[PDB]
Assembly symmetry: C2
Homo-oligomer: 218 residues x 2
């Protein structure tokens, strides 16, 4: 059935991108979660949406320092470790990096996720995706799109396309299906829109409300 | 003959990315200049390399304010206007924008450069290039590469590829020629490297030293 994914966990039940949020999303019965990561100065993947912190941009601060300042800030490995409690859960890691520093971060993430199962990486940065695919041939990837940049799909090594829900139309989906892509829309928080998207045959939905996603599928 | 282009003008003769620098580069006999631009809060294309200013990121500050703070900061139109004094000169505008805000800036730049001659836009951002091509079908474009991302060329509407000189090899050039691309390397400041690149048949060189580029060609 279509994947029901918790955006940054269950952001309305607990603070977004925190271990509690991810746990609550999985305890709610969702198929998995999406989590945002940025590389720290010392190469740790901090789980948070915004790149700017009280101590400066994430890439210029060591993880331990960000953690002292923000005690509930998880590192990637801690979130993926939840697969121990939920063996069937999947994790969509969105690699966020300043395009220009994306290739280096991508190579680092590739090494960290080597051979790991139940995880796929998505990114809005085509350059990071190319670097990821070269560094880890077996790691599933998804191309995030805020505007319709489908023209790049033929040149990207990705198994999925993650379009903003407003880009999802019958014709757009036909194009993605034509390439055998797995389609995951975001960020879907309304029943009406969720049903519209599923009626189009999408493979997954990322949303902030578990209740809305749970009944979808079978 | 191969284009001899002044990187940000003639950066050692005058402050980089200033009208004086561009004028000196053209007075030296170069075929054109490369200039960096970032969009201001009010949609003006400020000519400068760094995005961070004493007043904050360029996109969050109005041009007039940046100008008061930095009196020699040009706006794009002022640099392109130099074509009046040098009718044969060409201008390579590098659109710099935070990938995510690149499409919007690209659409704005496309409208500004509508029908203009002797100008081509390059960018490290594939998304900005796609937006530029859609908005201005007749505007020549170049794909800047800091690492070899040639795999994207087939999906980009570009007439040129602008590789960092360290990516230029006989095999790489054969691949680009195979697609009929115009190849422009940067940033070439040494005679040895310049001669190595020209021997490979490149179509243009962007460098900080006019003396090094002038004798190249015929």
């Amino acid at each position: 059935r279509p994947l029901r994914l918790g955006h940054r966990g269950a952001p309305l039940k607990a603070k977004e991108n925190t271990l509690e949020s991810f746990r609550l999303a999985l305890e709610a019965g969702l198929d998995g979660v999406e989590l945002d990561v940025w590389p720290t100065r010392d190469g740790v993947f901090a789980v948070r949406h915004d790149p700017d912190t009280p101590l400066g941009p994430v890439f210029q601060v060591d993880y331990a320092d960000l953690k002292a300042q923000e005690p509930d800030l998880p590192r990637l490995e801690e979130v993926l470790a939840l697969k121990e409690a939920f063996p069937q859960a999947v994790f969509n890691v969105e690699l966020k990096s300043f395009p220009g520093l994306g290739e280096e971060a991508a190579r680092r993430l590739a090494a960290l996720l080597r051979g790991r199962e139940g995880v796929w990486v998505s990114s809005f940065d085509p350059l990071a995706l190319l670097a990821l695919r070269k560094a880890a041939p077996g790691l599933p990837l998804g191309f995030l799109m805020a505007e319709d940049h489908s023209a790049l799909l033929p040149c990207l090594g990705v198994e999925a396309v993650h379009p903003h829900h407003a880009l999802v139309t019958e014709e757009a989906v036909a194009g993605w299906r034509k390439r055998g892509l797995f389609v995951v829309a975001w960020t879907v928080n309304e029943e009406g829109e969720a049903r519209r998207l599923l009626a189009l045959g999408l493979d997954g939905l990322i949303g902030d409300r578990p209740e809305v996603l749970l009944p979808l599928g079978g």
